[PDB]
Amino acid sequence: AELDDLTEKIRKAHQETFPSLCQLGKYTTNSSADHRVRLDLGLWDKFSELATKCIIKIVEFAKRLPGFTGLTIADQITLLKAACLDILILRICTRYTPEQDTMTFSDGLTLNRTQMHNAGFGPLTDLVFTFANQLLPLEMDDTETGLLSAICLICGDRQDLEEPTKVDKLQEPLLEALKIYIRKRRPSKPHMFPKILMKITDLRSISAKGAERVITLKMEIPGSMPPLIQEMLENSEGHEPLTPS
């Protein structure tokens, strides 16, 4: 339908806020490449910077989403606050090189599993690498990953939503676009729509243990947690069972 002016648009925002793995020239490093440790400071510094940049790019991708813009700020910040780490994981996992067991960051920095860890993923590591592999069989493409990303972002469950129903129906066509598009693109495998849609479930599993890493990590680090990372991966209101005051 003309429901593809939207598809088309998202695929553009994704592509322009997240470069492909095949178009990126890779460089490696050997610091912390032999074995795990609490946390290689150099690695942490590179990684954190990229992270910061990427969070920005995700906001950029956000704003480019049809309708997103026209939406409450506290609601937007909320939707993004809720999905950021979700999108980050999806993104990095699409920069996974099976053969070499590595992920490549936007500047082409290319870390092996151990470095992925020593850089700050720590415990969260073999988990994200699982998703990385869980993803290969899906052979998703840019538009698909763009849509999926946009569906985690435009979510109406997030607590503290002023116009949920707006946000709910705002993501109604996205769910339709992703269905049509995956179906038209891969006729012999129509079970790829629910299959890829459901990746969101293991996704949220990880972004959970994620926000948890954000702090259990901003501990072992001698300095401070970069601004934006904080302003994005924090604020969650005490852990239960905690009784009322």
Binding site: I56, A62, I73, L228, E231, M232
Partner: peptide
Amino acid sequence: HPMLMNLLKD
């Protein structure tokens, strides 16, 4: 939310 505020600003 200083930063975020400015990010969706411009």
